[PDB]
Paper text:
The recombinant proteins investigated were FXIIac, which has the native N-terminus, and a zymogen-like protease FXIIc, in which the N-terminus is blocked by the presence of two additional amino acids, Arg and Ser. Using the recombinant FXIIac protease in crystallization experiments, we followed a similar approach as the FXI protease (FXIac) of cocrystallization with the inhibitors PCK, PPACK, and corn trypsin inhibitor. FXIIac crystallized both in the presence and in the absence of PPACK at 10 °C, and the FXIIac crystal structure was determined by molecular replacement with the structure of the homologous HGFA protease and refined to an R-factor of 0.219 (data collection and refinement statistics are summarized in Table 1). A key feature that identifies the FXIIac structure as a zymogen is the absence of an oxyanion hole (Gly193 and Ser195) and a buried zymogen-like conformation of the Asp194 side chain, whereby it forms hydrogen bonds with the main chain nitrogen of Trp141. A second feature is that residues 182–183 from the 180-loop and residues 217–221 from the 220-loop of the S1 pocket are not visible in the electron density. In one crystal form, the S1 pocket loops are partially flexible, which is typical of a zymogen. The N-terminus is not observed in the FXIIac electron density, and Val16–Leu23 are presumed to be flexible, and do not efficiently insert into the core of the protease domain in this context (see discussion). We have previously observed in the FXI zymogen crystal structure, where there are no crystal packing contacts in the area of the active site, that the 180-loop and 220-loop are also not present in the electron density, suggesting S1 loop flexibility. The FXIIac zymogen conformation was unexpected, but is in agreement with the enzyme kinetic data described above, which showed that FXIIac has reduced catalytic activity as compared with β-FXIIa. The zymogen conformation of FXIIac is unexpected, as protease constructs for u-Pa, FXIa and trypsin lacking a heavy chain remnant have been crystallized in the active conformation.
Numbering used by the authors: 359 to 534, 538 to 569, 574 to 596
The structure:
Amino acid sequence: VALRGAHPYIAALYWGHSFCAGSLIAPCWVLTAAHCLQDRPAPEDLTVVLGQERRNHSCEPCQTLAVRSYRLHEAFSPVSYQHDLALLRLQEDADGSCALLSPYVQPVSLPSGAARPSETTLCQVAGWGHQFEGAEEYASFLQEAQVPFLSLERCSAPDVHGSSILPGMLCAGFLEDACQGDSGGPLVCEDQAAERRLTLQGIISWGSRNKPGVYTDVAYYLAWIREHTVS
Ligand SMILES: *[C@@H]1O[C@H](CO)[C@@H](O[C@@H]2O[C@H](CO)[C@@H](O[C@@H]3O[C@H](CO)[C@@H](O)[C@H](O)[C@H]3NC(C)=O)[C@H](O)[C@H]2NC(C)=O)[C@H](O)[C@H]1NC(C)=O
């Protein structure tokens, strides 16, 4: 029995005329890419929607929340895209409550740390993708894709991605498709060094169609994550 949605952890981030995807990791915390927020957008500007099916559409199970604070990695290189992750702190509603777990909204598990994915480890990426301005009624539904994992040996190679792959990045893709997937968005993969079979291995970074995708390697920042969520 399936009493939980597809990708019920996926968060949508709206401010101004800007948009990023994200990953609910606890009911009060969302994890994204750094570069979505370089410009230092004032927390009170941002809107985050959980449990959303189509981009910028409302829906019964959608929960809209305000963001009370965020932060980017100290070492985030706006040039190289290296420490590309930020945390956002949702705003506890009246009565001290962020993101009411439902079939449509549940956090996603962080990686074991001892998640050592081979290249036949199965992985999935989800998002909305490009949508044309205007005409909210012709939105697009959440989409998904199986991507194979890509060892850094094969990814860091120059016919491929070269010295552009720094520490704390990983790749998944086909060498040879990719318009779904939004900045900030989740890559989730089989783990089995956690009780929960599925874990959050990636955040969508850069990479884009004929060349692999590059992701912040979430285990790598696993301490940064706790150091900053335990608050
Ligand atoms: C579709 O995209 C829009 C961006 O183009 C989103 O816009 C945001 O809507 C919010 C309300 O849903 C705003 O917040 C509210 O602001 C006023 C204060 O002036 C108050 O009335 C509300 O209480 C407050 N919300 C609170 C406290 O929770 C945002 O400021 C607004 N931002 C912009 C730039 O327009 C849509 O929400 C988004 N929707 C969906 C469903 O995807």
